Amino acid sequence: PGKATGKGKPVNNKWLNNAGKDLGSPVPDRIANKLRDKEFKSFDDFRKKFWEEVSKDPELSKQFSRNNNDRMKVGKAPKTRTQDVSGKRTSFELHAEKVYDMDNISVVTPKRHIDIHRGK
């Protein structure tokens, strides 16, 4: 029964441009605001609700295409570009740096999620 805590961070209008490097892109503060009034059932329930809220924020929703907002409305992560694709991993990933502290969660591309857990 899962709860989320954390502040997140203020973000720009190219939220996921950094998702390729380091630990990625942060949970945005306004999203965090909403997620902390919720209850979850798994990190999976957390993930789906995370995408949901993204779809609804004026200032984030604007950065995704229609077909992407369409996924995120039912809790699926946005598809990456094809060039950031790896294997059968085609959408953006949450990475946990360790009940859900959103100040240690972030958003990465697949190939960066890869490198992160193989120590590069």
Partner 1 sequence: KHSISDYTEAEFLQLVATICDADATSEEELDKLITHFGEMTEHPSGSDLIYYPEEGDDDSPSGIVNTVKQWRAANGKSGFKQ
Residues 6+ apart with CB under 8 A from 109: 19, 20, 24, 80, 84, 92, 93
Stretch that binds Zn ion, among 17-25, 37-45, 75-83, 94-102 (CB under 5 A): 94-102
Q: Which of residues 65-104 bind partner 1 (CB under 8 A)?
A: 65-68, 70-71, 73-74, 76, 78-79, 81-82, 88, 90
Least CB distance to partner 1 at residue 85 (A): 9
84 with 110: CB under 8 angstroms?
A: yes
| Annotated binding residue 113 | yes
Integer-rounded Cα radius of gyration of the chain: 13
Residues that bind partner 1 (CB under 8 A): 65-68, 70-71, 73-74, 76, 78-79, 81-82, 88, 90
